[PDB]
Amino acid sequence: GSHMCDAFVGTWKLVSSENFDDYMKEVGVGFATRKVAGMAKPNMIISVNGDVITIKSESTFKNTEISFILGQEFDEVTADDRKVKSTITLDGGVLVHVQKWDGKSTTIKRKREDDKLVVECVMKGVTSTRVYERA
Ligand SMILES: c1ccc(-c2c3c(nc(O[C@H]4CCOC4)c2-c2nnn[nH]2)CCCCC3)cc1
Numbered sequence: 001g002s003h004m005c006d007a008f009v010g011t012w013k014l015v016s017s018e019n020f021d022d023y024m025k026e027v028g029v030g031f032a033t034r035k036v037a038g039m040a041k042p043n044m045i046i047s048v049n050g051d052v053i054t055i056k057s058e059s060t061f062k063n064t065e066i067s068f069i070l071g072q073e074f075d076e077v078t079a080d081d082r083k084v085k086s087t088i089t090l091d092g093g094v095l096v097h098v099q100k101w102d103g104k105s106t107t108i109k110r111k112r113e114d115d116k117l118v119v120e121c122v123m124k125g126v127t128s129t130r131v132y133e134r135a
Pocket of ligand 1: 024027029037038040043044057059062078080121
């Protein structure tokens, strides 16, 4: 039946982005990828089937898809082509996603706030906020 996770399901379109270029610099994304990725207006499509959560991002730049079980590490290829080890948990209603690669780490939080899905990405001190609304 219902899970608190249901608040995330649906198709969400990017409506605002703040500081993503600098976040991508901190991650180590090269100039060209930053420019083209920063231009994109992805949709994020979230679905749940049993214990498996799937998050797909679709854009003109790249399409990505992760499927996972909360608390169970998985290997992820990011849109910028990093091969990372990821674990996603629910903490107080927030999806918390850590990506580790090459001795580096980044944390991505996904939260439902009003009718928005708010995604906060942090690496060292650099934060980006991306807001999505229902498509
Ligand atoms: C088109 C397709 C994908 C991206 C993209 C990227 C990154 N991370 C993203 O997402 C973060 C934030 C939410 O989850 C993880 C998104 C993304 N996917 N969906 N929206 N933005 C990693 C850094 C470099 C750029 C690649 C951007 C443009």
